[PDB]
Amino acid sequence: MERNKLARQIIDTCLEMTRLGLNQGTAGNVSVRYQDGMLITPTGIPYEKLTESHIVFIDGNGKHEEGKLPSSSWRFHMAAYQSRPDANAVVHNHAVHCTAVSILNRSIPAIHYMIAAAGGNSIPCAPYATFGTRELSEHVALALKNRKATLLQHHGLIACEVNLEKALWLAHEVEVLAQLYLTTLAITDPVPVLSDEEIAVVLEKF
């Protein structure tokens, strides 16, 4: 874990996320905890043109590396790291299913046993607030207190985990759940859910 190997790795997450359909028109960003702060994708420079040299390091105070412009979503990446000390990588994105669920302002309940993968019996939704402002940072932080992903209302998805591969994987699983929810939800309401006890066994068992 040098800076340049995490930089390559961050960029690999971008092309992997694009591949899967989790990122459209360069909407999302990706970051890893580093030193006293983090390493994040910069704004502007289109994904397919990126290198290790462009990755920006924002320190713990919000002091970025002169000469580079961090993504605009960096404020709620830092919120994610102080909210969950165990998080080492954040993934942000506007995957279509997540975003439509977040536009209904809904948590996904326990419609499948993989719900437990984000730490509990649901994936919450954080209330809307103008991008890059203090209050959005605070909404994200309340949401990730006991959950490892969250929807952002009228906006998108933020997932966090112990490394990029597991963060990238969780973004992806939350996107399958969103879709299963919306599809079933067009047929019936409420959709059937597993109980809190059965979920209790799944969490223990994980």
**How do strand 125-126 and strand 56-58 relate by DSSP bridges?**
unpaired
Which residues inside 152-191 make contact with a second copy, applying CB under 8 A?
154-155, 169, 172-173, 176, 179-180, 182-188, 191
**Closest alpha carbon to 146 in 77, 203, 205:** 203
Which range binds Zn ion by CB under 5 A, 76-84, 95-103, 153-161, 174-182? Answer: 153-161
176 binds, among Zn ion, a second copy, none (CB under 5 to 8 A by kind): a second copy
Cβ-based neighbours of 160, under 8 Å, separated by 6 or more: 80, 84, 87, 89, 90, 91, 144, 148, 149, 167, 170
Site string for Zn ion, 155-174 (x = CB under 5 A): -x------------------
Crossing angle of helices 164-185 and 3-20, in 10° steps, is 20
CA distance 150 to 178: 11
Closer CB to a second copy, residue 1 or residue 186? Answer: 186
Tokens representing residue 141 in the block: 């932080």
Judged by beta carbon, residue 38 or residue 182, the one nearer a second copy is 182
> Which of the choices Zn ion, a second copy, none does residue 45 contact, using the CB cut-off of 5 to 8 A by kind?
none
Report the alpha-carbon distance of residue 166 to residue 125 in Å, rounded. 21
Q: Which residues bind a second copy (CB under 8 A)?
A: 24-25, 94, 96, 99-100, 103-105, 111-114, 128, 130-131, 154-155, 169, 172-173, 176, 179-180, 182-188, 191-192, 194, 198, 201-202, 205
